Amino acid sequence: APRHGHLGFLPRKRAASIRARVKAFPKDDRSKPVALTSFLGYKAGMTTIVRDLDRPGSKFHKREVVEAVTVVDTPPVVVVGVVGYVETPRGLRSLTTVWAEHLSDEVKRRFYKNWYKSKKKAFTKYSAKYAQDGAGIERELARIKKYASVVRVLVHTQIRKTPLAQKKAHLAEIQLNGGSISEKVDWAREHFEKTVAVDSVFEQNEMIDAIAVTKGHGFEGVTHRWGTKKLHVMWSVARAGQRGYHSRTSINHKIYRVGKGDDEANGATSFDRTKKTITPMGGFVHYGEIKNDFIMVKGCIPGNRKRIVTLRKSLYTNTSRKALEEVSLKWIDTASKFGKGRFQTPAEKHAFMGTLKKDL
Amino acid sequence: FNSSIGRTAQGKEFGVTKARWPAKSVKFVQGLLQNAAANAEAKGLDATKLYVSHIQVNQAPKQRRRTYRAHGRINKYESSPSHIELVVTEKEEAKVVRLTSRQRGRIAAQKRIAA
Amino acid sequence: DVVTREYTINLHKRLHGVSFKKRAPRAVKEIKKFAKLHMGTDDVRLAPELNQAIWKRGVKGVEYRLRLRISRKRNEEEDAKNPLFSYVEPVLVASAKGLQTVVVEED
RNA sequence: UUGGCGGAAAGGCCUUGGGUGCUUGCUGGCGAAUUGCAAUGUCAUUUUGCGUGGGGAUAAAUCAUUUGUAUACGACUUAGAUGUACAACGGGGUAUUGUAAGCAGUAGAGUAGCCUUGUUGUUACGAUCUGCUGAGAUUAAGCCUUUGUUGUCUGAUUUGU
RNA sequence: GCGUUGGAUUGUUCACCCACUAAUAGGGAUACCCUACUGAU
RNA sequence: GUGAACAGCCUCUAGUUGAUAGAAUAAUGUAGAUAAGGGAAGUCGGCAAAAUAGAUCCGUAACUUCGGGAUAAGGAUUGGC
RNA sequence: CGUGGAGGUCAGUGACGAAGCCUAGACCGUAAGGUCGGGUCGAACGGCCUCUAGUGCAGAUCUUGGUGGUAGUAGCAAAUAUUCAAAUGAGAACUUUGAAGACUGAAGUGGGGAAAGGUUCCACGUCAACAGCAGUUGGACGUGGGUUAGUCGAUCCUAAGA
RNA sequence: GAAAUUGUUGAAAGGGAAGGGCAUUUGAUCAGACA
């Protein structure tokens, strides 16, 4: 028989941060300009999608087929600083950080943990070190230009630009896949206190990796933890413990849309011709509205709603046809998931119901 | 005496994870602390400087109480009481060398060279 | 700061998924806690008329909403916690909808 | 004091300038006693403290509270000091069911009925039906939204190279 | 490295069929108490 | 009142409101329930759970010690004005 | 070597502190064991030659008594269910009253009896114990009060029977 | 008013063992004789 479990994710404990931390990146290619290797946003809900299908040879070629997607809030993302990393015979070593002369209340509120009692003195000496000349800064920058075979940039989100209310910014580091590390840090230095799209990293007809932390479910025992049957000790004998809130990594994820907040009628295919953003009736379920850019990707990401995720651009040069097919949407369901949704727009609600006692 | 205890955070001041909020012990105890503050005031002592220097507690004789349980047995059931005492005190913000001649002449020579 | 108020309080969103024999008593504590939040005092007193109003539909039949009068007051001597407390008595309506909080004028 | 170099775990290695000494490179003068024949005969270096007189900067965290992306208890994540604030209600949006109390009717099998003896006599009762009625009630407790009203917005503790 | 089935028949392992699938190979190894294991500060 | 009833359910007369309490919903337990589609394949073993069950109309075989088996089986019906 | 007692002996020690006890304070003896100093303590006791015995302990699923871990753990979880204000008092999840909510639902959580129990019945006062929580309450504790017969019954009859 | 056992203070030590033996170090503590 098989074993009622895997063995790879074996120390089934909770992770240490809700930010699932990037561990891998595709290595480099020092011929291109710089391309950001990752991005991050906040998962919001699911929808259903039909899609006409250019899949040569498949049974469903040139047919409509319904599939199911998710959605994530993807505001613009501002850069605040960089770090270098050098190869050793130990591994890698953080040797310098540098920050960007003016920092948001959000990230100042991240590094502090009890905000309002704080004097909010986070970088007041660093901005003073940003002198008339920036001498020490350029000292500790050109160092990295010399050293630091590979380099990362810090980001933070603009979370006030979401329906969510947490007030706090989720830092991260992001690796680059350009060359000319001097050019990398020069590019980033120009990008200091400057923000970046998600259609400026990704596009359609793309595959991604989705790394996040799962929904928690508490201390569920064997019968629902491992799907094991019901009536010294070894470490693979299917004993009860914590489920959920593990980190995971989900790959081979076909994007269909790279949305846009300013673009009205985000739910518009070529077919619908209806001025509706994808935010369906009722708001999202435990998430609010989508008045920003977004992504529509098939399958189902690890997470729960109003949870953060991190994105990576598939980490290698894929080989399957499905990694290269050309997407064409036909219709977005835009109904409320707060019930068995029937109607896309409240004007359609008015139209099919008619006028009512409260209407006049 | 810290077993099968639910843990809670309010001991993190003390650097300890396990803690609990007894009432009865505390009622008797602050009875005593009020008695001792009263007695120090009776002596005519200050309380603003005053700290507990010594507390003490030690077992005491048991009630022989009972209950009745399975297989027809008087299995005992009984107390664990306490003597208590404490002493409170006003805070207060407050040899010759045998040696040898070989060691003596050396230091005398260091003086001799000390100009 | 002697003050009186009206207040609504929504029990359907405070007594969801509860043991039937504790739906009604728990509402008492929820009401006192509501006074503790809004008025900002811990020692609370109630009305047996209001207790009737809560209990009248049994224990597992408590109404989804009520409407209340609250009167923070001074206190008598050496009730050592504070010179103030809170008192709670109901006010009668065919519905507690279309209402909202108000300071009632003084007479 | 000058300019260099070095990131692998650099924390050091050079070099300019002078200042400052000592020179056993050569030759002189003075002193060494007494630890009594030796007794490690104490010379370095780690850390810390109290005092010294001189510069330098004047914060977090935890608890309590609240949320809940988490939840055995702990923990992890959030919010809160005069505002893009936070909350309790209320409105609006979604959905949930399935058409309320209050009445009115020339619907209402029928049976009596005061007699204006009908020729729908009308008056009594009368399951229900028809209309005010997709009406009514509910809606976050682990939904959306808010220019509304009304309140909160300085409580305890601990920490130092 | 990964996999080796659903049934029919006896208290009984002895005995031996039907059909699928790629195959349906053979073997061994009260319990709160301290330990180990699963999880948590 | 109910209904065949002294079953069970509700109530008046009368009497208790006693059974250590509080805050929380993690599993698993203990008692109690529901589950599509198939319908005892599972299992030594229809163990337990579940199925009809009340009242009326028709009807109820073989076998027999003719007395029964027999609430046989099996079909229909059950409200209110 | 040591112990309980006995015959002698040291004109023995002894309130100016015998005996016992404690003591990482000393000395002896290879060792059993002895000796000493300090502290505590308060009235008898020891050295030697001899005697006599109920004479020496790690143990006996030993005996009696006491005390520990386990542990502030298991557990106080059947009996639908309790809630608000006032009084009392220092103190109320629990006593009393009052307003609501429930129940036994008359083959009862009602009112009376037999056997048995024997002051539990009633008041006042009261909590150190008991009421497996607490208690200002109670069948608990202290002090008292109270059981009225020509007709109910026993006694009388005889039953199987002794 | 002993012992198990228990607490407070003082000293010391401590990574899945403790206790004991031979010698010594560190720290505490201590008797004797010099005439």
Side-chain angles (χ1 to χ4, degrees), chain A residues 24 39 202 207-212 249-253 255 301 309-316 318:
Chain A
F39 211 83
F202 305 81
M207 304 298 275
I208 45 154
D209 288 12
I211 59 188
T249 289
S250 66
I251 61 180
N252 283 11
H253 263 183
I255 282 155
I301 283 159
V309 307
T310 314
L311 280 296
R312 192 171 63 253
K313 59 207 284 170
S314 64
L315 185 137
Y316 64 99
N318 206 296

Side-chain angles (χ1 to χ4, degrees), chain B residues 13-65:
Chain B
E13 186 184 2
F14 315 117
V16 174
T17 306
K18 308 214 276 181
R20 177 175 276 190
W21 307 280
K24 202 166 190 201
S25 70
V26 179
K27 283 154 66 188
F28 290 111
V29 164
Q30 69 191 331
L32 273 79
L33 302 159
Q34 184 252 303
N35 184 19
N39 292 303
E41 289 286 294
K43 276 192 197 159
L45 264 61
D46 188 279
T48 74
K49 330 186 187 70
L50 175 50
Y51 73 110
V52 70
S53 70
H54 173 72
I55 199 155
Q56 180 164 13
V57 42
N58 33 5
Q59 263 170 341
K62 290 149 162 274
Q63 310 308 96
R64 287 77 156 77
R65 194 162 60 165

Side-chain angles (χ1 to χ4, degrees), chain A residues 182-360:
Chain A
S182 59
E183 202 161 85
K184 290 191 192 248
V185 306
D186 287 324
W187 174 95
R189 189 167 60 81
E190 205 75 67
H191 287 46
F192 270 20
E193 317 205 61
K194 295 280 183 158
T195 173
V196 160
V198 70
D199 60 26
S200 69
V201 171
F202 305 81
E203 64 184 54
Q204 307 185 50
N205 309 322
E206 187 164 9
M207 304 298 275
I208 45 154
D209 288 12
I211 59 188
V213 191
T214 66
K215 181 173 68 194
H217 304 75
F219 194 89
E220 291 290 350
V222 302
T223 189
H224 187 26
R225 191 138 177 273
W226 310 83
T228 306
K229 196 254 175 181
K230 299 151 47 156
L231 257 56
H232 308 77
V233 164
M234 276 166 177
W235 77 294
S236 72
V237 79
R239 303 296 301 287
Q242 177 92 48
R243 193 145 72 84
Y245 204 33
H246 300 321
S247 183
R248 283 285 187 285
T249 289
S250 66
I251 61 180
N252 283 11
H253 263 183
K254 191 72 190 169
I255 282 155
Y256 294 141
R257 174 61 148 283
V258 189
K260 284 180 85 189
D262 62 347
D263 175 32
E264 303 94 334
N266 280 327
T269 58
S270 46
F271 283 63
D272 285 88
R273 214 157 290 286
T274 65
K275 196 193 305 315
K276 41 153 182 287
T277 185
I278 50 153
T279 299
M281 294 306 293
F284 262 106
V285 170
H286 310 99
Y287 205 97
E289 52 271 28
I290 311 290
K291 57 185 198 304
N292 273 335
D293 311 90
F294 58 88
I295 295 285
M296 209 161 293
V297 54
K298 93 191 284 291
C300 44
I301 283 159
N304 60 342
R305 72 292 183 286
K306 63 185 210 294
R307 198 171 283 279
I308 200 163
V309 307
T310 314
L311 280 296
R312 192 171 63 253
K313 59 207 284 170
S314 64
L315 185 137
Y316 64 99
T317 311
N318 206 296
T319 314
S320 189
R321 302 304 310 148
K322 195 176 76 154
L324 186 133
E325 297 187 45
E326 279 280 20
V327 310
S328 46
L329 292 164
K330 197 179 276 179
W331 165 62
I332 287 151
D333 182 10
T334 313
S336 178
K337 317 310 208 290
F338 204 99
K340 323 297 199 83
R342 324 193 275 268
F343 298 161
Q344 306 304 272
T345 60
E348 278 158 84
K349 207 187 178 198
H350 290 181
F352 185 74
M353 286 267 205
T355 51
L356 308 172
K357 187 172 190 167
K358 189 161 263 150
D359 302 8
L360 68 162

Side-chain angles (χ1 to χ4, degrees), chain A residues 40-73:
Chain A
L40 63 157
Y42 301 77
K43 201 177 93 139
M46 300 265 263
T47 72
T48 301
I49 298 295
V50 68
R51 182 177 93 87
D52 74 320
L53 222 64
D54 296 82
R55 201 173 286 166
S58 296
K59 286 307 312 314
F60 303 86
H61 179 60
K62 300 263 163 283
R63 258 65 60 82
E64 74 208 59
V65 299
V66 73
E67 283 220 54
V69 312
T70 194
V71 170
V72 59
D73 184 9

Side-chain angles (χ1 to χ4, degrees), chain B residues 76-88:
Chain B
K76 75 182 179 60
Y77 192 79
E78 51 179 6
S79 71
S80 303
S82 50
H83 287 244
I84 295 158
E85 55 203 10
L86 61 95
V87 190
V88 296

Side-chain angles (χ1 to χ4, degrees), chain C residues 4-14 27 30-39 50 63-70 88-104:
Chain C
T4 174
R5 288 198 166 74
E6 296 279 328
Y7 274 117
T8 51
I9 194 174
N10 190 351
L11 263 54
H12 193 49
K13 62 178 282 185
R14 279 160 148 66
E30 289 289 351
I31 282 153
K32 289 155 153 224
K33 184 171 75 177
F34 195 84
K36 195 186 187 175
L37 263 297
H38 283 285
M39 214 58 31
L50 179 134
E63 273 287 320
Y64 303 104
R65 295 204 178 74
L66 316 170
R67 181 70 165 157
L68 318 189
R69 173 150 287 202
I70 281 153
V88 178
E89 59 277 47
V91 284
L92 58 99
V93 290
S95 188
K97 299 186 223 185
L99 306 177
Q100 53 183 12
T101 63
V102 52
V103 175
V104 291

